[PDB]
Design a protein around this ligand. Structure first.
Ligand SMILES: Cc1cc2nc3c(=O)[nH]c(=O)nc-3n(C[C@H](O)[C@H](O)[C@H](O)COP(=O)(O)OP(=O)(O)OC[C@H]3O[C@@H](n4cnc5c(N)ncnc54)[C@H](O)[C@@H]3O)c2cc1C
Ligand SMILES: Cc1cc2nc3c(=O)[nH]c(=O)nc-3n(C[C@H](O)[C@H](O)[C@H](O)COP(=O)(O)OP(=O)(O)OC[C@H]3O[C@@H](n4cnc5c(N)ncnc54)[C@H](O)[C@@H]3O)c2cc1C
Ligand SMILES: Nc1ncnc2c1ncn2[C@@H]1O[C@H](CSCC[C@H](N)C(=O)O)[C@@H](O)[C@H]1O
Ligand SMILES: Nc1ncnc2c1ncn2[C@@H]1O[C@H](CSCC[C@H](N)C(=O)O)[C@@H](O)[C@H]1O
Lengths: 596, 590
């Protein structure tokens, strides 16, 4: 589409006449708050914001690597959520060495939009604008604050304008305003700027009333008075937050509609206070929320500036995209179009092998004690089925899979239960698909109006005895199935032709060239299996004492099982991988007449 | 298999393989230069291994004249995709001169040079020397051999021949006696040269052929064979039939009991009949892509092209020859350079195969209205003769016969061409047939091939206007591009990016999408597409004539247009697009 500077996107929708919206957020003070905020990021991205924001305050150690910092929240938005992101930054109580350090760190992590702020008790925001330009040149897009009714500390309202003028002239690209109550206020302010010679975009900020706290909040945020009109309607319902928010919505809709109708406003900046409901309904009533949102690819896109060309990945990190980005982040270029057109996969320190969950919860799910390998088989079975284990606990994750199953796995639940129950322990799979509509709600992706294709895939740990039987069976399948077996020692075998990669998901779209975003690559597989095997020990086996029978079992599996991936090349035909497994079970059991 | 001639030599014959060979002489006349390129294209059908062009300083072989040895062989590689050996001789020529010739050989893409003494500071020997110093290895230089031998005595000459192995192989003279050079085989193993031997073969095709055998071979045909040609009448056709039969038998035990290098003499018939008779002539192979791979080394990675030059492959090579790198994978991510212009429509290797007298009979020695022109398009597609008994072999745009896939939509094409939709390119839609399909297959076996339906055609300004209306209700399904000779165009191609219209899915591999429809490339193509009206058809007629006027009027006013149906799993809707356009051009009102 368009992978261009924010201010390039903005003047495009300008000329185009398309109105847009943005969302402002604040870094939470606890991890659980941080975790939930990122979930909201993902839910509200579906609306199509031009951009989102993360505020900045020095009481919150905002430049640090703490998970709750403005810097790490912004960085998550860009690198994991794929969003165009604006990092706010204030220069009250800061020296040159501090600010320059923060700017370098944001550049490394992929940020590329700064809002230059003074902050409240380097003396004025303009010093930060002029400084970003001299020290980083034009690398960053920069925006700056404006005040429709004048800044409080300013003497003349007229003088505040002249100041604004100078910081915009120092090197800013657009203005975001403080909240207001009457469209007419924005309008005069705009004509004051227009008459001053300020020529950049001025985005109005909108603050939705979302309950009773909103009144005290917006006066703290802005130092404006709340009008008796709003006050008189709200004080009768002072204790009914639900009813208040429908009035906030009516007010916001009416205001924005009077702004949008202006034509002198290109977009809308919402102060969300990290809450979803009210802001989404205001935008939907306006017609600015995306009607039929599509996932762009089967995996989520990064917004890092270096990584704009990537549109194909190996399938092996599908449940661990954070590990993939980490192991590839030193690369100079990324594959575009075909994988096989090659920098090495980087190695890893342990914090990526650790689980999120505490030890006591994992033990309740995976088992305080194991009595044999079959104890392990049932944990995978229960991960797939959803039923409770014999102590009453659902299995919500595996060392390889910390989220729930995608929708596509419902196409093959019973087949998967069958093989896990016989000791083929799966960690990745996908059904075959023969050109379903690209808008399909279970497997669709990419532009509307085209056709999506998948070859059936299966990946799994199994004992040496089973693998050895699998290889004999694979001879009848030599031309149809591609196969790769490897153990923790690195003994491996594969019929990948000249060790080339195999496309397994792809899409044909009207008016465009082909997109093949997922492949099975034998070279990548040999780096992936180093993690896959290590996760047995780092998340499961260490839950037990070194001399325990439960550890002996997990360690045994790690030292002996094979990792296996299988692809059925004949996507127009029924998935043949289930019959491959049944043929293996027969071969293993060929001397027992009770299974024939 | 895309490797050098040394690797391309030892790898086949060890693993139960034997190969062809064909030697040609550079022609003397322009008309002969075009005849020879055509004969290059035909006999390339015979799945040969390597081809060969002779050399002699009297014919200024290093020059740029179309008759020069080095141009013929440069054309063989660049425009015909044959792997070729350029002969080179050292007879009396300065140290600098041979160097300049060697510079041009590899530079023009030539890889297999053959060093030979020239019959009037070096003699036979100093061939590999000159080259080797600036040659490299496994580039495959080859040296001459005369089995029954001729000037010296075999003590030094026969010593000098297997001594010059240092040179991947050698070529042997005509063997008049069956297995006469067979004594050369084991004796050549005794010579100690670790390279293989390549044997000759020379046919009889006329009376004045016989004498030609004495002049080039400097040997005497056996008395027995002369006892059968003297009775062979002045009917060179007679003498010929006995020639191929003399041949097929000789090497028959020879191919096994012992590659066959056959001295064509720039003639096809005999050397071919012996080929399929010897069991070494492939007449229907699988195609690796919908279009033919260039033999040049710099186009190693080329695997996607615009659909617009499908009938004019050699023009595409000509207009792309200045490019440093070639598009791989997708077209649009290769940031292509500009196409070079085609200003010379009379290049011997791009001209039409038909002389002007033939084109007049098939296209009309006079034209009376625009409909005169429609009918010629219709006859080309149908195969039926015109009113004067002549089938239409070709069009300005299409100098060969239809591909097999067009039979899937012959009747549909006849309907639109009759109505003034003058087509020059098409393909059917294909929803996943086996890659080994005989009509539309290509690529590795055991996969699936796909096509979006395509249509490209000239039509009048009035028809184009009405087509635009009809397309308003196909906007989501049909991609379109229209343009006239002046350059006014309209397309709904999104962001002007290209559209993939043929692709395949193969076991254990990544996707291959060799054909696109690209709105940028289409602006360069249209210049060539329109110029063919005047250069091929219009200039058949006197400049002031009513015929030329009609062609001139079409060139100056019609639009060229291409259409794609994106919904490959559904029946082709391009035929309904046209019916609706022709409906809208009629005055019902109820
Ligand atoms: C959209 C928006 C986002 C915000 N985000 C944050 C955030 O993330 N974190 C945070 O802590 N605060 C934030 N703020 C608060 C903002 O910092 C305060 O309003 C602050 O008091 C003023 O900062 P400023 O960048 O507007 O400063 P300035 O532009 O420097 O204005 C401050 C005052 O100085 C005066 N002045 C300007 N230039 C000169 C000059 N050359 N000489 C003399 N006087 C001058 C102006 O008239 C004005 O009265 C935000 C405000 C807005 C509107
Ligand atoms: C397949 C083939 C293709 C040909 N193509 C051409 C062509 O394109 N143009 C053309 O003009 N002719 C061509 N000829 C003919 C060739 O040029 C003549 O045979 C020429 O007179 C020398 O051939 P040669 O390459 O064997 O020479 P050389 O290899 O130089 O001569 C070897 C012969 O001469 C003797 N000899 C010569 N010098 C020495 C020496 N210093 N020490 C020892 N022995 C020596 C050897 O004993 C041996 O008999 C071709 C011949 C063949 C078989
Ligand atoms: N333990 C397990 N066994 C089998 N499949 C699993 C699994 N855990 C997760 N999966 C499945 O593995 C898939 C990873 S996404 C697979 C590739 C994707 N269809 C694409 O186009 O790239 C999801 O479908 C997920 O539900
Ligand atoms: N005058 C004409 N009108 C319509 N089609 C024509 C034509 N002359 C030639 N053709 C057809 O146009 C096609 C050019 S080859 C088409 C490309 C092919 N689909 C691919 O995958 O690359 C041939 O099929 C040929 O037979």
């Amino acid at each position: 589409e368009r992978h261009e500077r924010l201010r390039e996107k903005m003047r495009r929708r300008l000329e185009s006449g398309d109105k847009w919206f943005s969302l402002e957020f604040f870094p939470p003070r606890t991890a659980e708050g941080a975790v939930n905020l990122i979930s909201r990021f993902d839910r509200m991205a579906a609306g199509g914001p031009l951009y989102i924001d993360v505020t900045w305050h020095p009481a919150g150690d905002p430049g640090s690597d703490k998970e709750t910092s403005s810097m790490m929240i912004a960085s998550t938005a860009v690198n994991y959520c794929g969003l165009e992101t604006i990092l706010h930054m204030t220069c009250c109580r800061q020296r040159l060495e501090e600010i320059t350090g923060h700017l370098h760190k944001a550049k490394q992590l992929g940020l590329k939009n700064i809002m230059a702020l003074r902050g409240d008790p380097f003396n004025y925001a303009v010093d930060l604008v002029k400084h970003i330009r001299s020290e980083f040149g034009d690398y960053f897009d920069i925006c700056v604050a404006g005040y429709p009714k004048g800044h409080p500390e300013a003497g003349s309202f007229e003088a505040d304008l002249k100041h604004l003028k100078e910081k915009v002239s120092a090197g800013a690209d657009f203005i975001i305003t403080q909240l207001f109550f009457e469209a007419d206020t924005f309008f005069r302010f705009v004509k004051a700027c227009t008459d001053m010679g300020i020529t950049c975009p001025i985005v109005p900020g909108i603050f939705p009333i979302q309950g009773y706290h909103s009144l005290r909040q917006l006066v703290k945020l802005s130092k404006l008075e709340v009008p008796q009109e709003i006050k008189d309607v709200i004080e009768p319902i002072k204790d009914n937050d639900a009813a208040i928010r429908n009035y906030g919505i009516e007010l916001a809709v009416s205001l924005c509609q009077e702004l949008l109708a202006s034509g002198l406003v290109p977009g809308l900046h919402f102060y969300t206070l990290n809450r979803e409901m009210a802001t989404t309904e205001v935008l939907k009533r306006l017609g600015m929320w995306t009607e039929d949102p599509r996932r762009p690819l089967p995996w989520a896109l990064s917004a890092h500036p270096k990584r704009r060309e990537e549109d194909v990945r190996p399938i092996f990190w599908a449940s661990r995209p954070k590990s993939y980005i980490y192991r590839t982040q030193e690369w100079d270029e990324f594959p575009n179009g075909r994988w096989g057109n090659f920098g090495e996969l980087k190695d890893y320190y342990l914090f990526y092998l650790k689980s999120k969950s505490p030890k006591e919860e994992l033990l309740k799910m995976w088992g305080e004690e194991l009595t044999s390998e079959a104890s392990v088989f049932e944990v995978f079975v229960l991960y797939l089925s959803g039923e409770p284990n014999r102590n009453g606990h659902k299995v919500t994750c595996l060392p390889w899979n910390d989220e729930p199953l995608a929708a596509e796995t419902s196409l093959l639940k019973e087949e998967l239960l069958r093989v896990n129950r016989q000791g083929i322990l799966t960690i990745n799979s996908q059904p075959n698909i023969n050109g379903k509509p690209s808008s399909d709600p279970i497997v669709g992706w990419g532009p509307s109006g085209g056709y999506v294709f998948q070859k059936a895939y299966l990946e799994f740990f199994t004992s040496r005895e089973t693998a050895e039987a699998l290889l004999q069976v694979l001879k009848k399948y030599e031309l149809r199935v591609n196969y790769h077996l490897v153990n923790v020692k690195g003994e491996n075998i594969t019929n990948a032709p000249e060790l080339q990669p195999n496309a397994v998901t792809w899409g044909i779209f009207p008016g465009r060239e082909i997109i093949q975003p997922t492949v099975v690559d034998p070279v990548s597989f040999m780096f992936w299996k180093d993690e896959a095997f290590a996760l047995w020990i780092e998340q499961w086996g260490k839950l037990y004492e070194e001399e325990s029978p439960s550890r002996t079992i997990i360690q045994y599996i790690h030292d002996n099982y094979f990792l296996v991936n299988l692809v059925d090349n004949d996507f127009p035909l029924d998935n043949c991988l289930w019959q491959v497994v049944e043929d293996t079970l027969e071969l293993l059991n060929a001397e027992n007449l009770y299974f024939q």
